[PDB]
Each structure stands twice: as structure tokens, then as C-alpha cells.
């Protein structure tokens, strides 16, 4: 199986023979030394790299991303950053007439990011550093770079890519996908591959019979439906966010503090649907604006409410060749409110997740939607808790003699991120915060402003 | 050229992704690639060890075990040993007990999990108390260093306060992971590695190999990051690949990935620190007792001198009349220690911060005042001590605390922030000014030697190298203005070579911020006999004297006549002088007794000042940083721009070390938190939001390299501000005693936040 793409400006074409590589050793084995491998799991941004396609350009992770992927795409790295005649790009010079480094070795990751920034002239720097670690400076001197370098026209031969292009399996139409899985059930289905590439570079698994769902258009479509909005599987976390900017401000606030920008570019929300995970952030607040989920198998396709997919810890209510195929979301839900507890803001995976959607016929409490991950072997209502909140007044109080009832509802685990105590307490603070917050408070340390 | 804020010898290198590190070093298609099988048990005899699933899998070429070692099996840095290879027990979780060499990295991880490894467990060592129960230590027994009589001073106190919190290790987190290379050389072996004490590894690689250091030669050009973290723990990968080079007949490259690093290698120690101090009824301090106890690991590392430097400074920046320290070495069974930045300094610097504030808090006088009252006097009959014996003669804190209370606007904001608290229900501001005092030179005073080597070729162009490895201090690029100012010529003729043992041997590791204070002045002896030798030639040629020749700018002038310093150089070749230098730094005035506690162990002391201001969220614990304001003392420094980066950097690294970073090992003795998605450091947003350094501009009252001080390690300290401060913001929840322990996650600050609301 062959691919092509651009690599830094020239054509290149490769035979795959093994699917799953990771973009990161092909480059460092072809010696395009420059993309440095830092934890080889997603988290230091240390090897990121520029794509670029119709869609425009972006900054990922190589070491998260396999070869299949790039097909039909330009690739920029670090050693690509700089004009063909070695013109240093208005953010290199200004890294170095402002000390933007010390030790060097995280410098190519934000070079690039910095660059794929400025190409669409992207201004919010903490959200689109934030998954590039550098352990010497202190950011500042990075911060200063960036501004200095923005008040610069942008390269003119990093656009000119845009003119291009014009084993394992790659469906093109989500029917030929449908078909095909239902023939081989087996098989291992990868998106945006962000929790599948840990298998092979941490639990050093192999995986054979395998698919990639990137290269349907079909299967990552936003679209507008009378009673809500479809969203396809293959739909990114990050456009996902770009959309639910307007109608879903909260979802939009939590999505900002899923991952980093470079995983919220590839990652999928039908891929952080059917991994499972009880610590997923997008279920939680799907839930809690109650949306529904859509399985697929051939030409069959059920339809349930999203809770209702996730059974046990690990298990989920999905059939041997079917695959999910979007969720739905209502047009409207200004009650969401979402929640996220780690021990650090950006990049970090919650201890506890809270979405809070309560409904209210003038000071009384119609409907309450209640949605926590992390509490549990996996993400769901608090039952008890929602119960004995309907008809009562909306107040502080009220709400803090109902908080004993999510005691009931879930018993956290105890663990690395947070003891159980603390878990349950924060369950419960997530709780008067919702009050505090719609009561108009102030509540949240992000808006403090110095 | 010393004094200007010029760029990092790499930067461009950097920018462009040019710059290599260990692990782009092209080598021969040949290459085997190694990976060591770990321990599974925290503490067992080992039982039985079949490694024929390991030769059968794919792409193995050889396989390893303590009997294959031809000879020494020991990677420590200290006098007891530390195996490489497991021998018949395991004492961590995580200890490498084979190894393997494959014709790939990832083969090589591959095979390294197919050990079928029989143990017999044994009772294991976790916990300090564990430790204390079982006396399991180091040193056969605690140390003990006592100034005056303080139970006597502590019982006729008008006030006091005693308390006791724990303080959590950290993790070095290198962007550049450990890593080495081994290429035989006819009878002998080049190393390349990322560390910094290539003569350590010299001495450790010859030794696992029988033979002679000449025989063994370690380059080393940069390393991504080392925060002390490879002062000694390249020594494995180093051994290892030497060893598999020369059973193989072949290169051998080793790097951990990430998992491996962070569950093999040491971290900053953990301490527990049990306080009473006391004062007068004015305020001032009257004595402190203070007992340490420190989690080490399974062996002694570098634990020795760390915990002698947390005793050191276990009076942070005051004048304590009476002073005890009682300091335990824990053994357990959990990775070995070792140094961070800071080595020890912290741990003991912020053991005496959190008592004075709990001894403030008590007498319901403000922090602030209490601290600036204690300091030691200004400079300039009779200086005052340390419990260590050593004149404090250059303390500076005072003005300079009163300097930065001003630009930082302290005494307004901290009412601003008194208003808006009690506004506010969910959410409080905190804010807190913490000093630092910080020794300098390692305190086993041998160490405290540098050498270099020079040389000037015929076009004139120059050749600098030294003993320090680069690590993104800016080290290479000070040396360079060093030298330049010294021979009177430009910088860019200036090349720094990499560090190599062939080049100036018996190197001590770059640390104890002595870096540029040692080899700076080796670079400055070498480069002042050169110029000696040309104005000796200058002068002999144009009759007159070798002080009226003049070396500036690339220019010389002699006699009202002015050449290039190339035409000199040239003309010196034709004549025969010598171009080349040797050139060695031994710190002066240093001595001390580390068994009494008392001497000179330092040649001076660095200072600064911080004030943060944070904010936190009552109900969870949330929270963040919002301004710092430093000012910090550099003495002359040799490049402010180099300066400023360094303080900025160690300020997170501090502040990082006392909120999110937080080290875990579940009941078995593994360590949780092994990967940076579950240990946190300081992201790009968690930068304070506003962020004030300035310098302190006063030459060294000691003769050092153009009076300037190390600036590495002591700025590291300033991070305490921000605990203070998210404790400021604990105790204006309440009235009682927040008891904030170290690392303030959000989890433990919203425990401190309960215990102030008296809510439990
Ligand atoms: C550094 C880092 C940070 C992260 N932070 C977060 C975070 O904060 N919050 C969070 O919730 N998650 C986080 N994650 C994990 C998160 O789930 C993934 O990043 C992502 O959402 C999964 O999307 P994906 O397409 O890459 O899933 P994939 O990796 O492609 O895998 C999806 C899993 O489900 C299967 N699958 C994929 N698509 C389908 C389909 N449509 N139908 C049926 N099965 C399918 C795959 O076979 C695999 O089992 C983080 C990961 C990393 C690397
Ligand atoms: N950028 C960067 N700075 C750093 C480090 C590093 O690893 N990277 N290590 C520190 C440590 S532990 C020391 S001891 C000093 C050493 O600097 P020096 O050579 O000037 O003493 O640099 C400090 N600054
Ligand atoms: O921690 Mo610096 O002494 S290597
Ligand atoms: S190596 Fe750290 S994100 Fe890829
Ligand atoms: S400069 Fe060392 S990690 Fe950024
Ligand atoms: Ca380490």
C-alpha cells in the first residue's frame, strides 16, 4: 500500500508496510532528526508537527499520529519552518531575540505550534501552548516571542503548500465502512488514534486487522436537524468546540480544557465515546444536556439516550460489527453547566467531571440533569440526587441538604489524581456551585483577573 | 563582552531544530539497542530468572544478568554500592535486573517484558515511620548539630510555636530523557552521553570494564535538561552500554523511554520537618529546634551532602541565637534520591519559612515584619554567625526586602486584597514575601577545582573549553564572554568545543550552581597566560613594556601603533610562541567539618526576594498565581539577560514543586505517578499572569569571576512565596491554623481551607 504527501515542500511517497508506525519514528528514522520524542504518549507536544489540507493547517502530535493518516496531506517539521533561501520565520528570530530558550530541546514543538499559529493568525497563546512543556524558562520569554513575532506578515512559502494534491483499511463513504466492519468484526477501529497509540508505544501491543475512520467526509458532518444537531463520530473535539462556541458556550468552555489543542485537533468525539472511559469528558456533558447517541451496523441503526450506552466499567452496549455514528445534541440547553476538577488547568485528565443542566418554572425546579465522570466504573446520573430535587425551591440550602444523597448515588475510587474523600466532597461542591454560580457569583478562579 | 545580554551560544541551532542531542548522534547502521527488565517487588530475594523468552524474541541480539558483568557492578556515587544489574535481590520497584540488546529501541522494550522472574518477597520498607520503626537508615544513626542551648531558650519564651508538615519530592522532569552511547575503540571505549559529570562516568565505565581511565573517553556537547537530575544517574545507561559494546564487538546506544525514566531514576527527597521555634517579647527569634527526616531510597546516592545542605540552611535567612538540627537518613525501599536544584537548600530553607509564619500567625504580628526583624545584620565589632559558625558578611535582604516592597507595592495591595476577601464568599486572595539565602560551592570541598584549555589558531579565531556541561543555564555562552573579554576580542571569534574528558580531566559535576564561578575562572587564567604571552611578545618587538600593550575591541596597541589580533597572533606563530593554554580554578577560603557543623563550607551567599499573590477557590481547592514580583541578587552579573531567564525559569520550577507536582506509590511500593499525564508540572498557563524580575546590581564582595554569583540554583527558592501565599489565602478562611502541607494541590489546599473554617 502506497501513500503520498508533501514533506516540507517536496513530494514525497511511501510504502507502508506496517499501518501503524507512528509518524514520529518514520520522520526520525528517515533522519529528519529535528521532531524530538519527550514522553512518546501525547502529553509534551515536544514532537509536534504542521498539517495542512483543505481544512487548513494545524498543529498535532506526530508521535500520536500513524502514517495512513497524512495521506493526501503537506507536512511541515522543524526543519521545514524556515524559508528555502534559510530566512529564518518572524517567530524563530523572535525565540531568539527574546530568549524563548534554554536548553533547546522543546524549542523545535513550540517553534512549530508557534508557527502553525501564525499561519491562521491564532492569538490565544495559554490555549494554544498549553500541550508544549518546557521545563526551563517560564513561559514568559515564550509569551513575549509570541507576541513580538505576531505584527509579522506571515511566511509566504508555508502557504504555498496549500496547492497540493491538486495492509489496512481506508473507507471513504461511511457505507463502505458499515459494510466492511460488519465483516470483520474483529478489527480494530482508529480515528483520531489518541488512546489506540498507547497500546503500541506504552503497552506495546500490536494490532492487526485495523481501519481508519480519518478519511471519511461522510462520517464528520455538523448538521443543522429540526430537532437538534447531528453530529458525526469523526467529528473532532476540536471543531466540535468551534461549533458549540454559539449555541453550547458551556460545552465550548469545557471542551477548551480537554487535552491540548494539538489532541483536540485528531481526536474525535465518537472515538471519546467509544473508548469508555468513566473519566471521558465529553459523556458527562452530553448527558447532562441529554443527547443521544446513534450506533450503526450495515444498514441497521439503532438509537438510544447517550447514558444508556455505557454499562459496566469497560463494557458498553455495542454489537459485534456495529460502530458508532454520531450523537445528537438539542438546539438548545442554557442550564448546562460543566465542571472539571485535575490537579493542574490545562492538559489533565479530571478527578471529577460535573454537568449540571436544571430546568426552573419560576423559583421551582422542573427537570434536573445531573451527569458525573470519575465518580464511578462509569459516567451517569445521580439519581437519588435528581429525585429529591424536583419541585423544590431552587435556594442554596435546599440543595445542601440534598448533597447526602450523592453518597448514595456513587462511592468513588481512591487513586493517584484524588482520595475518594476528596472526590466525593468535590461531587458535592460542583453542587453549590451551580447554585452560586446561576445565582449570579462570583465563582470561578479563571475569571480572576490580576 | 561580560555584562551584555547576549543570546545563547545555541539559540540558532535551537530554533531551527539543527541543534543535536544524544539521540541524533548519527552511528553505524550496526548499532544494538538496550533496554534493562525491571523488578516487579519492592523487596525480594530473587528465586529464579528464566531469560529464554527474552533471547527468542524478535531482533535479540544478547541478553544480561550481574554474572555476565565482567567486572565492577556498581553505578553509586558514593562509597556503598549501587548495582547495576540486580544481584539475587531487588530492593525497589523498578530496579533493572537484566539487560538487553536488540537490533531495535523498540524490540529491545519488547523483549525486556518476556522474563519469567521467580521472587520471595519479602517485608518492605515505604513509609518514613516504616523506616524509623525498623531503623532502617543511613549513616548507623541520625546527625546531630546543635548552636548554644535551645530547650533552655524554647522553655523561657514570651512566644511560641511548634508544628510539624510534610514536604513532597519532585520529579526532574528533563525534556531530554537519560540516554548514552558506547562505540569501541581499539582496546578502549568513547562514550557519548547526556550528563553532567562525564568524569564520573568515566571513572564508573572503566571501572565496569577493567580498565584504565586513559582508556576510556566521554564527550558530552548539551544535554535537554538536568536540574540535577544527571549529576549521577547516567552512570547505568553508561555502564550498560559499555558493557553490551564490548561482549558485542559493537555501538551500543541506550535511551529510557519516558515510563522507564520516571520509575528507575531518583528525585528530589521528600522530607518530614518537626518545628518549635520561639521569640522575645520584641519579636525577635530566640531559638529553633528542628528535627529532619528524609526518604532516601534504597541506596545512598548523593543523600549525604543533600541532607547536609538542608541542614545548612535550616535558618533560612535569620539570625537564630539557638539552633538544633536532627537529621534522619531514611532508608526504604523506593527509588534511590538525588539531586535537584537546590540540593537539600530548599528543603531546610522552607522548613524554617513555615515556622516563622506559624510562629507569626501566632503572635498575630505580620510575617513580613517578624522576617524583616530577624534578618542577619547588613554588612559594615563582632559579625554575627550561623549556627554553622560561618560570618554572615554580605546579607543584603534587608534593603533589598524594603526595595521590593516598594516596587511591588506591598503594603496597599495587601489591604486591597483584605477588602476584596471580605467581599467574597467562594473565592480569597492571598499574597506572601519570602527571602533567600543560599551558599555557594559544594560543601565536600574538593569538588571545588575547574579546569580549561584554550587555543588560538593562526587566522586568529579562538577555541574555548572547559569542564561544565551545558544544560541550558547559558553556561557556554558566558564562558565565551569571559574569554573574549579577557583576550580583547569579539565574541564570535570565540568557539565553545564539547565537554571531554581528553580535554581537561578530573572534572567535578557541574552543580552547586558552581558552573560558571569555577570554570570562569579556569577560562580566565588561560586566557590571561595567552595574553601574557603576546603582550610579552608585543613588547619585546616594539621595545617597551608588556602593561602598555593593549588588547580591545580585536585591536592591539603598542607604542602609538595599532594592528588587528589576528596580525599579532600570526606574527606570534612566525615567532614561535606558544598558542595553547591550560588554565584551573581551586575555590579559595573553603573549610569545614561536616561530623561537628562547623567551619567555612561556603565562599558566599546568594540573595533575593519574592512576593506572590494567588487566588483560590473555597470550595475545591482550585487555584493559581496571579502576580510575582522578584528581585534577585546576581552580584555583577555576566549576562543579565541569561540571569533574568534562569531566575524565571527556577521560580517555576519552585513554585511547580509546591502546588501540582505530586509524587505517588500505591500500597505495593509502585510508583503511580510515572508518566506526565499523571505527574503535572507547571504548564504554559500556570506562568504567574503578572511577572516582575529585576536584578540586584552589586558586585560579590569575594573575589569572583568579575564579581558576579552563581545565579542557578538559589533563585530556585523564591517558589516558597507562592506557598506562603496560597497559605495567606488558607488563613484569611478562618481562625484556625490552616496546617497546609506541601505539595499544595487542590486537594490539600481545600483540606487546609476546612481546617481554618474549623470545618474538620
Ligand atoms: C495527551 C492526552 C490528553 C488527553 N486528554 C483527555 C481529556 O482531557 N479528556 C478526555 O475525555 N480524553 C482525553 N484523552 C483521551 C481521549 O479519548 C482521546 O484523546 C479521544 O477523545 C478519543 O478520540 P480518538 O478518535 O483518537 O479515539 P481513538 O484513539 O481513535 O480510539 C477510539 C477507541 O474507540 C474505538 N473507536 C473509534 N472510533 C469509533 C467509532 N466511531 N465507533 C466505534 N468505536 C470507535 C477505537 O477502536 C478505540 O477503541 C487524552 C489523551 C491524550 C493523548
Ligand atoms: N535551563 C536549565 N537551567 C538550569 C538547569 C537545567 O537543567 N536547565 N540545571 C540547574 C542546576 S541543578 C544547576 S546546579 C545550575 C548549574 O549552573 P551552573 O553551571 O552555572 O552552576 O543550572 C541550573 N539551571
Ligand atoms: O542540583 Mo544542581 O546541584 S545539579
Ligand atoms: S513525545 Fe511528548 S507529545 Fe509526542
Ligand atoms: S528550553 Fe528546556 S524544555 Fe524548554
Ligand atoms: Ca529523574
Known amino acids: ?450 | 563582552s561580560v555584562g551584555k545580554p547576549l543570546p545563547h551560544d545555541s539559540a540558532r541551532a535551537h530554533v531551527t531544530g539543527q541543534a543535536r542531542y544524544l539521540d541524533d548522534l548519527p552511528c553505524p547502521a550496526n548499532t544494538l539497542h538496550l533496554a534493562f527488565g525491571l523488578s516487579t517487588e519492592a523487596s525480594a530475594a530473587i528465586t529464579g530468572l528464566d531469560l529464554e523468552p527474552v533471547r527468542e524474541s524478535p531482533g535479540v541480539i544478547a541478553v544480561f544478568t550481574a554474572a555476565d558483568l565482567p567486572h565492577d557492578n556498581d553505578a553509586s556515587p558514593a562509597p556503598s554500592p549501587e548495582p547495576v544489574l540486580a544481584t539475587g535481590e531487588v530492593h525497589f520497584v523498578g530496579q533493572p535486573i537484566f539487560l538487553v540488546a536488540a537490533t531495535s529501541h523498540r524490540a529491545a522494550r519488547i523483549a525486556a517484558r518476556k522474563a519469567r522472574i521467580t521472587y520471595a518477597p519479602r517485608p518492605a520498607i515505604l513509609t518514613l515511620d516504616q523506616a524509623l520503626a525498623a531503623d532502617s537508615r543511613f549513616e548507623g544513626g541520625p546527625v546531630i548539630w546543635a548552636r548554644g542551648d535551645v530547650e533552655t531558650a524554647l522553655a523561657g519564651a514570651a512566644h511560641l510555636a511548634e508544628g510539624c508538615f510534610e514536604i513532597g519530592g519532585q520529579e526532574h522532569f528533563y525534556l531530554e530523557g537519560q540516554a548514552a552511547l558506547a562505540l569501541p575503540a581499539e582496546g578502549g571505549v568513547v562514550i557519548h552521553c547526556s550528563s553532567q559529570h562525564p568524569s564520573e562516568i568515566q571513572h564508573k565505565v572503566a571501572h565496569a570494564l577493567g580498565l584504565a581511565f586513559h582508556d576510556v573517553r566521554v564527550e558530552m556537547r548539551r544535554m535537554g535538561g538536568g536540574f540535577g537530575g544527571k549529576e549521577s544517574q547516567g552512570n547505568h545507561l553508561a555502564i550498560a552500554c559499555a558493557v553490551a559494546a564490548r561482549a558485542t564487538g559493537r555501538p551500543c546506544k541506550m535511551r529510557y523511554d519516558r515510563d522507564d525514566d520516571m520509575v528507575i531514576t531518583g528525585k528530589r527527597h521528600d522530607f518530614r520537618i518537626r518545628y518549635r521555634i520561639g521569640a522575645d517579647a520584641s519579636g525577635k527569634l530566640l531559638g529553633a529546634d528542628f528535627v529532619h527526616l528524609a526518604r532516601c531510597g534504597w541506596s545512598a546516592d548523593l543523600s549525604l551532602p543533600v541532607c547536609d545542605r538542608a541542614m545548612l540552611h535550616a535558618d533560612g535567612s535569620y539570625f537564630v541565637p539557638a539552633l538544633r538540627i536532627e537529621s534522619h537518613r531514611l532508608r526504604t525501599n523506593t527509588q534511590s534520591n538525588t539531586a535537584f536544584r537546590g540540593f537539600g537548600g530548599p528543603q531546610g530553607a522552607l522548613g524554617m519559612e513555615r515556622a516563622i509564619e506559624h510562629l507569626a500567625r501566632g503572635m498575630g504580628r505580620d510575617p513580613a515584619e517578624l522576617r524583616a526583624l530577624n534578618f542577619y545584620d547588613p554588612p559594615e565589632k563582632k559579625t554575627q554567625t550561623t549556627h554553622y559558625g560561618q560570618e554572615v558578611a554580605d546579607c543584603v535582604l534587608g534593603e533589598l526586602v524594603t526595595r521590593l516592597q516598594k516596587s511591588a507595592n506591598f503594603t496597599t495591595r495587601r489591604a486591597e486584597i483584605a477588602a476584596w476577601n471580605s467581599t467574597n464568599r467562594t473565592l480569597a486572595r492571598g499574597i506572601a514575601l519570602s527571602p533567600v539565602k543560599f551558599g555557594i560551592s559544594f560543601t565536600l570541598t574538593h569538588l571545588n577545582q575547574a579546569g580549561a584549555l584554550v587555543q588560538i589558531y593562526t587566522d586568529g579565531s579562538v577555541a574555548l573549553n572547559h569542564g561544565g556541561t551545558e544544560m541550558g543555564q547559558g553556561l557556554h555562552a558566558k564562558m565565551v564572554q569571559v574569554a573574549a573579554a579577557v583576550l580583547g576580542i569579539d565574541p564570535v571569534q570565540v568557539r565553545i568545543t564539547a565537554t571531554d574528558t581528553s580535554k581537561v580531566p578530573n572534572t567535578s559535576a557541574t552543580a552547586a550552581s558552581s558552573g560558571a564561578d569555577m570554570n570562569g575562572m579556569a577560562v580566565k587564567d588561560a586566557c590571561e597566560t595567552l595574553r601574557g604571552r603576546l603582550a610579552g611578545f608585543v613588547a619585546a618587538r616594539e621595545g617597551c613594556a608588556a602593561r602598555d600593550v593593549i588588547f580591545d575591541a580585536g585591536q592591539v596597541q603598542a607604542s602609538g601603533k595599532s594592528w588587528r589580533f589576528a596580525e599579532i597572533v600570526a606574527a606570534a606563530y612566525m615567532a614561535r610562541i606558544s598558542l595553547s593554554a591550560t588554565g584551573f580554578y581551586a575555590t579559595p577560603k573553603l573549610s569545614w567539618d561536616r561530623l561537628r557543623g562547623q567551619g567555612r563550607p561556603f565562599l558566599y551567599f546568594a540573595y533575593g526576594a519574592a512576593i506572590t499573590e494567588v487566588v483560590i477557590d473555597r470550595l475545591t481547592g482550585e487555584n493559581r498565581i496571579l502576580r510575582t514580583d522578584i528581585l534577585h541578587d546576581a552580584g555583577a552579573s555576566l549576562n543579565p539577560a541569561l540571569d533574568i531567564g534562569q531566575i524565571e525559569g527556577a521560580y517555576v520550577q519552585g513554585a511547580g514543586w509546591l502546588t501540582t507536582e505530586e509524587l505517588v506509590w500505591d500500597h505495593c511500593g509502585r510508583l503511580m505517578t510515572h508518566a506526565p499525564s499523571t505527574y503535572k508540572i507547571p504548564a504554559f498557563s500556570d506562568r504567574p499572569r503578572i511577572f516582575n524580575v529585576a536584578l540586584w546590581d552589586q558586585p560579590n564582595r569575594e573575589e569572583t569571576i568579575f564579581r558576579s554569583k552563581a545565579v542557578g540554583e538559589p533563585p530556585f527558592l523564591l517558589g516558597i512565596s507562592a506557598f506562603l501565599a496560597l497559605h495567606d489565602a488558607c488563613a484569611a478562611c478562618g481562625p484556625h491554623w490552616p496546617d497546609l502541607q506541601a505539595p499544595a494541590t487542590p486537594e490539600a489546599v481545600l483540606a487546609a481551607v476546612r481546617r481554618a473554617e474549623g470545618r474538620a
Open chain 1, 1 to 450: 500500500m502506497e501513500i503520498a504527501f508533501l514533506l516540507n515542500g517536496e513530494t514525497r511517497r511511501v510504502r507502508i508496510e506496517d499501518p501503524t508506525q507512528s509518524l514520529l519514528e518514520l520522520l526520525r528514522a528517515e533522519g529528519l532528526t529535528g521532531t524530538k520524542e519527550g514522553c512518546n504518549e501525547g502529553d509534551c507536544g515536544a514532537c509536534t508537527v504542521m498539517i495542512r489540507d483543505a481544512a487548513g493547517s494545524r498543529a498535532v502530535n506526530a508521535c500520536l499520529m500513524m502514517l495512513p493518516q497524512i495521506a493526501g496531506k503537506a507536512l511541515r517539521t522543524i526543519e521545514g519552518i524556515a524559508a528555502p533561501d534559510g530566512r529564518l520565520h518572524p517567530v524563530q528570530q523572535a525565540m531568539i531575540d527574546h530568549h524563548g530558550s534554554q536548553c533547546g530541546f522543546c524549542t523545535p514543538g513550540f517553534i512549530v505550534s508557534m508557527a502553525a499559529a501564525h499561519d491562521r493568525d491564532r492569538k490565544d497563546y495559554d490555549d494554544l501552548l498549553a500541550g508544549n512543556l518546557c521545563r526551563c524558562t517560564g513561559y514568559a520569554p515564550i509569551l513575549r516571542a509570541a507576541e513580538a513575532a505576531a505584527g509579522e506578515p506571515p511566511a509566504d512559502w508555508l502557504q504555498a503548500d496549500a496547492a497540493f494534491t491538486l495492509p489496512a483499511f481506508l473507507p471513504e463513504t461511511s457505507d463502505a465502512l458499515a459494510d466492511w466492519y460488519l465483516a470483520h468484526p474483529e478489527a480494530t477501529l482508529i480515528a483520531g488514534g489518541t488512546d489506540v497509540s498507547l497500546w503500541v508505544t506504552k503497552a506495546l501491543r500490536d494490532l492487526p486487522e485495523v481501519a481508519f475512520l480519518s478519511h471519511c467526509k461522510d462520517l464528520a458532518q455538523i448538521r443543522e436537524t429540526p430537532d437538534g444537531y447531528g453530529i458525526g463520530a469523526g467529528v473532532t473535539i476540536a471543531a466540535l468546540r468551534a461549533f458549540a462556541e454559539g449555541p453550547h458556550p458551556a460545552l465550548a468552555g469545557l471542551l477548551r480544557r480537554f487535552a491540548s489543542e494539538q489532541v483536540r485537533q485528531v481526536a474525535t468525539i465518537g472515538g471519546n465515546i467509544a473508548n469508555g472511559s468513566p473519566i471521558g469528558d465529553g459523556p458527562p456533558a452530553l448527558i447532562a444536556m441529554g443527547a443521544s447517541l446513534t450506533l450503526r451496523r450495515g444498514q441497521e441503526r439503532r438509537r438510544m439516550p447517550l447514558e444508556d450506552f455505557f454499562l459496566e466499567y469497560r463494557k458498553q452496549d455495542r454489537r459485534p460489527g456495529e460502530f458508532v455514528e454520531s450523537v445528537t445534541l438539542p438546539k438548545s440547553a442554557p442550564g448546562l453547566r460543566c465542571y472539571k476538577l485535575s490537579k493542574r488547568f490545562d492538559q489533565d485528565i479530571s478527578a471529577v467531571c460535573g454537568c449540571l443542566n436544571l430546568t426552573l418554572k419560576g423559583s421551582k425546579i422542573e427537570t434536573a440533569r445531573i451527569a458525573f465522570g470519575g465518580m464511578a466504573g462509569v459516567p451517569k446520573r445521580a439519581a437519588a440526587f435528581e429525585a429529591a430535587l424536583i419541585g423544590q425551591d431552587f435556594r442554596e440550602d435546599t440543595i445542601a441538604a440534598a448533597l447526602p444523597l450523592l453518597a448514595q448515588d456513587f462511592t468513588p475510587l481512591s487513586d493517584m489524581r484524588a482520595s475518594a474523600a476528596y472526590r466525593m466532597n468535590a461531587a458535592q461542591a460542583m453542587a453549590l456551585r451551580y447554585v452560586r454560580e446561576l445565582s449570579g457569583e462570583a465563582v470561578a478562579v479563571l475569571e480572576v483577573m490580576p
